[PDB]
Design a protein around this ligand. Structure first.
Ligand code: CHL
Ligand code: CHL
Ligand code: CHL
Ligand code: CHL
Ligand code: CLA
Ligand code: CLA
Ligand code: CLA
Ligand SMILES: CC1=C[C@H](O)CC(C)(C)[C@H]1/C=C/C(C)=C/C=C/C(C)=C/C=C/C=C(C)/C=C/C=C(C)/C=C/C1=C(C)C[C@H](O)CC1(C)C
Ligand SMILES: CC1=C[C@H](O)CC(C)(C)[C@H]1/C=C/C(C)=C/C=C/C(C)=C/C=C/C=C(C)/C=C/C=C(C)/C=C/C1=C(C)C[C@H](O)CC1(C)C
Ligand SMILES: CC1=C[C@H](O)CC(C)(C)[C@H]1/C=C/C(C)=C/C=C/C(C)=C/C=C/C=C(C)/C=C/C=C(C)/C=C/C1=C(C)C[C@H](O)CC1(C)C
Ligand SMILES: CCCCCCCCCCCCO[C@@H]1O[C@H](CO)[C@@H](O[C@H]2O[C@H](CO)[C@@H](O)[C@H](O)[C@H]2O)[C@H](O)[C@H]1O
Ligand SMILES: CCCCCCCCCCCCCCCC(=O)O
Lengths: 229, 227, 213
């Protein structure tokens, strides 16, 4: 079985049953069965949210270059005021999140449509609703379960890159790649920061500290700026 | 049996003559633990091969460019074109990434011998790795292992140990004199009694710090000498 | 056999290497009586865990002060928070004794009567307050990720790291007080001064630690 460190022995709890199992659990966070059952769903949810966000941020930059994703919340203007938009989001997510959660707490107890009795998801697994949520499957499901986790772990690490790049460069994903491609030797973080016993040098936060939005002033801090290289 | 580091000394029981360059020399008994001896032998191989490349670099560079001082070649302003004043940070980026791969590969071979003896990409490409620290194959492109490997391992460790002492001579001579290893010899031969450690020692000719592209790197000599 | 604090000296009898961080150190035999030893075990863990949070709090806020982020020095934070935020000191202190009082008294009676806080008396919660071991109250509230209920060997190793890191933090907090008292500056200001001049800027030249110096 391919492993994260060739030649290494995987944790005893990491046999190889779960998709994406490359024997990586150095801290032993998944040695408890009931804990592993939660973290597995959490990894899937994080993966799918990140994959859509990384796709959306890149597309938004191409279709709407003038708008920096980090500044979108304040810039995007709609007739449905911030509160009206949030109310709708809150109720819709409360329902879907509770429905998905109850599946994890009692599998098979939330596969039935609550308005139409004729529609019920077939018996399935937590994290893999299927049924109406899976109209087409282009290939072996097991193989795609590996593709989903691998493309998700990469996206989750990309978003974090988009965030730190935004705070260190003030630019969207593409605008950074171009800066780096213009001068790779002088655009890497090593060429932007340096700590030695004598002194410490860190790139400045390029994100305004506060934003003014509909007369509120929203706090907008950089992430662990004090611990920045 | 074999020759030892001194006349009358009894070799440690753990040093029986298996490893090349075994003069039964372990005054501080650091090889008594088998696990430690294995790691220390790898460490000794690493320090030997790196030091032999270092002695050869300082000497070759000194002959080709006698105007460039080895102790201060790392300064980017002294980098050869087109690398002069190149972003040192960007340069360290390449070294960290490349070295980290090769060093973790070699490391995993220590943790599990013969566990990383295959190309992780182009499967089928494999190094023989007869002994730990001796990969061979692509690493031995001329086939010199297919002979008296043990006698060649002796020449390697012996030349390496001598090069490790020499390199530290170059460093200390550079710190006390301010010149490279062939320039120091010339100064000695120029006036052996006039120029020697008796007078050279007592002075650190190295600044306290240098500004590299905006960063102050603190510098120290190996002894409290006038700095 | 087990490494001891003073190599060559036999470990005390009341110390059999069973407890985490057992290096046979009890020169004044203060833990000779067992029940007393159990109490001191929870005491060292509670002192140590607070010191670890303390040390990590001072180090981060000290870094933020070293850089230009406007974080007050640890010895000045108490006044800054109350002043800038117009917080009433008496209210905050009494609220703390209310919350800590509840948590401490429940931990106290668990020590006096192990498992006695899992009867459901507290909002019907039972298993989250039973306690795994003295000074180790696992469950789903205090050990939310199950590290104690998965891989017994990993649990033992984690206990060793916790006690050693807690004893280091307890030593570090005594250092933060002694250094402030002797120098009047912050901890990362002291580290910068030493790093700048390690042979001329240390305790021997502070004019306080060695009076005859
Ligand atoms: C009759 C006297 C009586 C006395 C003196 C005590 C004393 C105590 N009880 Mg006890 N109880 C008493 C009766 C009863 N208890 C309980 C049930 C419990 C339980 C289940 C527990 C205790 C616990 C405790 C201890 C809590 C320790 C602490 O610091 O708390 C102070 C902590 C506080 C949080 C203070 C409470 C709030 C404060 C008075 C201010 C309130 C502010 C609010 C904002 C109010 C706002 C209201 C508005 C918004 C509507 C304590 C020594 C606890 C303990 O340690 O057990 C080992 C515990 O777990 N008691 C019942 C019902 C069975 C009782 C009577 O019927
Ligand atoms: C769900 C994930 C999500 C993420 C990762 C972000 C991320 C971001 N938002 Mg956004 N938002 C998100 C959802 C939403 N935003 C907005 C509305 C806005 C506005 C109006 C603004 C942003 C801004 C920003 C950026 C400034 C970061 C900052 O300082 O925040 C720190 C956030 C706070 C200090 C608020 C409190 C923290 C957090 C919300 C607590 C959550 C607690 C839980 C409810 C429990 C940032 C990259 C700002 C911007 O444009 O930057 C220049 C900005 O002005 N967002 C809405 C309304 C529909 C969202 C709905 O889901
Ligand atoms: C591999 C061996 C190697 C050796 C023996 C030397 C030796 C030398 N370099 Mg050199 N270098 C070496 C590699 C490299 N150098 C440079 C870049 C430079 C520059 C730019 C300069 C030197 C300088 C010097 C000289 C003075 C340095 C001194 O006194 O140290 C001072 C040493 C220290 C303060 C501490 C360094 C050791 C540290 C323990 C190393 C390990 C730390 C880790 C990398 C990570 C630490 C972070 C952790 C906590 C996460 C000296 C002759 C200086 C010079 O020429 O002065 C005239 C100088 O300015 N070197 C690069 C980057 C391409 C190297 C890459 O491998
Ligand atoms: C738990 C340990 C603890 C320690 C060591 C200190 C230490 C200190 N507090 Mg502090 N505090 C502590 C807890 C707490 N404080 C506060 C609230 C404040 C305020 C509001 C102020 C301090 C202040 C101070 C500093 C001035 C001297 C003083 O009055 O000390 C008192 C404490 C001790 C002498 C010993 C404490 C127990 C050992 C000092 C370094 C003052 C300050 O920052 O001055 C610039 C100040 O104005 N503290 C709270 C919340 C109510 C605390 C705990 O709950
Ligand atoms: C978590 C995913 C996510 C989030 C939070 C956002 C958020 C945002 N996007 Mg965006 N986007 C995404 C994914 C996402 N996008 C993806 C995957 C794509 C590629 C198709 C795009 C392509 C895109 C473009 C081209 C643009 C935005 C724009 C915007 C901003 C304002 C436009 C808007 O939302 O008005 C309201 C949005 C709607 C009315 C559409 C309703 C939602 C559809 C119709 C239903 C789909 C539901 C779906 C099945 C649920 C699963 C998704 C999953 C993430 C949970 C806003 C901050 C605009 C912008 O940048 O403004 C400056 C803009 O130009 N996005
Ligand atoms: C034998 C013990 C010994 C000790 C304890 C010292 C101690 C000292 N010597 Mg020194 N020295 C020694 C032997 C010793 N020396 C010998 C045998 C020679 C003849 C080569 C010298 C020649 C010498 C010179 C020329 C100078 C010193 C200086 C110094 C002082 C500066 C420290 C330094 O690193 O300078 C130099 C480091 C060394 C000399 C290496 C010491 C190695 C010895 C042999 C110890 C073994 C220091 C207190 C300096 C001084 O006077 O301060 C102003 C200085 O200029 N020494
Ligand atoms: C809400 C106001 C606020 C403001 C103006 C700041 C400002 C600052 N914080 Mg932060 N912090 C806050 C709240 C705030 N913080 C809260 C509520 C927490 C608890 C989670 C923290 C935990 C925290 C940490 C651990 C660190 C900072 C640090 C810093 C400094 C570096 C930039 C940064 O934000 O780091 C980012 C840290 C964050 C936690 C960002 C998240 C905070 C958002 C605003 C949540 C607020 C929610 C609420 C509804 C509004 C900076 C001056 C760094 C520092 O100390 O430098 C030495 C540091 O490492 N803060
Ligand atoms: C055996 C034992 C045991 C018993 O028990 C006892 C006792 C005695 C303790 C012991 C002993 C020990 C010893 C002797 C050791 C030695 C060491 C050394 C000297 C090393 C070096 C080592 C050395 C080394 C590595 C070296 C390295 C080097 C290099 C890389 C190079 C570099 C460079 C060059 C090219 C040039 C330029 O311009 C600069 C630079 C960049 C700088
Ligand atoms: C064992 C033994 C045995 C034998 O028999 C005898 C003898 C020897 C006697 C013994 C003992 C010894 C010792 C050494 C002890 C020690 C102790 C300590 C040091 C503690 C600390 C301890 C310490 C600790 C807790 C700490 C804590 C801390 C905290 C909470 C916090 C703080 C802070 C912060 C964050 C920040 C802001 O600013 C505020 C404050 C508030 C300021
Ligand atoms: C229980 C639980 C359960 C679930 O399941 C999972 C989880 C969540 C994971 C868990 C949790 C955990 C935690 C919370 C941890 C924390 C820790 C810490 C804070 C530590 C510190 C720790 C800390 C420490 C050691 C400290 C250290 C310190 C030191 C040495 C110091 C040093 C120094 C001094 C003195 C002075 C100067 O001037 C400066 C310096 C140089 C700075
Ligand atoms: C048990 C665990 C904790 C043990 C250690 C606790 C140490 C507490 C140290 C407090 C030292 C300062 O003591 C406290 O200082 C603040 C400083 O504003 C005072 O605070 C006073 O003014 C401020 C406004 O400026 C307001 O909170 C209020 O008007 C009043 O309380 C308190 O009246 C005083 O009691
Ligand atoms: C600043 C102080 C405000 C008052 C805070 C009081 C909080 C209640 C503390 C009561 C603890 C009683 C514990 C029971 C006695 C015992 O365990 O032996």
């Amino acid at each position: 079985r391919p492993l994260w460190l060739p030649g290494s022995t995987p944790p005893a709890h990491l046999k190889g049953d779960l998709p994406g199992d490359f024997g990586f659990d150095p801290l032993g966070l998944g040695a408890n069965a009931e804990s592993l059952k939660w973290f597995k769903e959490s990894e899937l949810v994080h993966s799918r949210w990140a994959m859509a966000a990384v796709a959306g941020i890149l597309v938004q930059e191409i279709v709407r270059p003038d708008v920096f994703w980090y500044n979108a919340g304040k810039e995007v203007e709609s007739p449905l005021g911030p509160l009206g938009l949030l109310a709708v989001e809150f109720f819709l997510m409360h329902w879907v999140e509770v429905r998905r959660w109850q599946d994890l707490r009692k599998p098979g107890s939330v596969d039935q449509d609550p308005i139409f009795s004729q529609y019920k998801l077939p018996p399935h697994e937590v994290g893999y609703p299927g049924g109406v949520f899976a109209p087409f499957i282009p290939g072996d499901l097991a193989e795609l379960k590996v593709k989903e986790i691998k493309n998700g772990r990469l996206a989750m690490l990309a978003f974090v890159g988009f965030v730190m790049a935004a705070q260190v460069t003030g630019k969207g994903p593409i605008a950074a790649l171009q800066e780096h491609l213009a001068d790779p030797w002088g655009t890497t973080i090593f060429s932007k920061a340096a700590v030695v016993p004598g002194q410490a040098v860190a790139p400045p936060c390029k994100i305004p500290a506060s934003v003014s939005y509909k007369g509120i002033e929203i706090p907008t801090p950089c992430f662990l700026q004090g611990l920045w290289p | 049996d074999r020759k030892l580091w001194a006349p009358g000394v009894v070799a440690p029981e753990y040093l029986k003559g298996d490893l090349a360059g075994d003069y039964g020399w372990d005054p501080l008994g650091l090889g008594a633990d088998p696990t430690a001896l294995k790691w220390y032998r790898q460490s000794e191989l690493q320090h030997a091969r790196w030091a032999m490349l270092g002695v050869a670099g300082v000497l070759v560079q000194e002959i080709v460019k006698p105007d460039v001082y080895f102790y201060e070649a790392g300064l980017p302003q002294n980098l050869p074109e087109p690398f002069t004043n190149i972003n040192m940070g960007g340069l360290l980026a390449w070294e960290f990434i490349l070295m980290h791969w090769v060093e973790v590969r070699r490391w995993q071979d220590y943790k599990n011998f013969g566990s990383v003896n295959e190309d992780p990409i182009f499967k089928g490409n494999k190094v023989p790795n007869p002994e730990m620290g001796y990969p061979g194959g692509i690493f031995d492109p001329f086939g010199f292992s297919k002979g008296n490997l043990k006698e060649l391992q002796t020449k390697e460790i012996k030349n390496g140990r001598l090069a490790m002492i020499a390199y530290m001579a170059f460093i200390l001579q550079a710190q006390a004199t301010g010149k490279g290893p062939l320039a120091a010899l010339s100064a000695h031969l120029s006036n052996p009694f006039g120029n020697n450690i008796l007078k050279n020692i007592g002075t650190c000719t190295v600044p306290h710090s240098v500004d590299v592209q905006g960063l102050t790197i603190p510098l120290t000599c190996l002894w409290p000498g006038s700095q | 056999v087990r490494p001891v604090w003073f190599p060559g000296n036999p470990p005390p009898a009341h110390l059999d290497g069973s407890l985490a961080g057992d290096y046979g150190f009890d020169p004044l035999f203060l833990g000779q009586e067992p029940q007393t030893l159990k109490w001191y075990v929870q005491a060292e863990l509670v002192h140590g865990r607070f010191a670890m949070l303390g040390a990590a709090g001072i180090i981060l806020t000290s870094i933020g002060a070293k850089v230009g982020l406007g974080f007050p020095e640890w010895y000045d934070a108490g006044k800054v928070v109350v002043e800038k935020n117009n917080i009433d000191f008496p209210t905050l202190m009494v609220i703390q004794f209310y919350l800590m009082g509840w948590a401490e008294t429940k931990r106290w009676y668990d020590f006096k009567n192990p498992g006695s806080q899992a009867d459901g008396s507290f909002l019907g919660f039972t298993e989250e307050f039973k306690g795994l071991e003295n000074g180790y109250p696992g469950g789903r509230f205090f050990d939310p990720m199950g590290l104690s209920r998965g891989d017994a060997a990993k649990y033992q190793e984690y206990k060793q790291k916790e006690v050693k890191n807690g004893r280091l933090a307890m030593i570090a907090c005594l250092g933060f007080a002694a250094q402030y008292a002797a120098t009047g500056k912050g901890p990362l200001d002291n580290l910068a001064d030493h790093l700048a001049d390690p042979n001329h800027v240390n305790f021997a030249t502070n004019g306080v630690s060695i009076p005859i110096a």
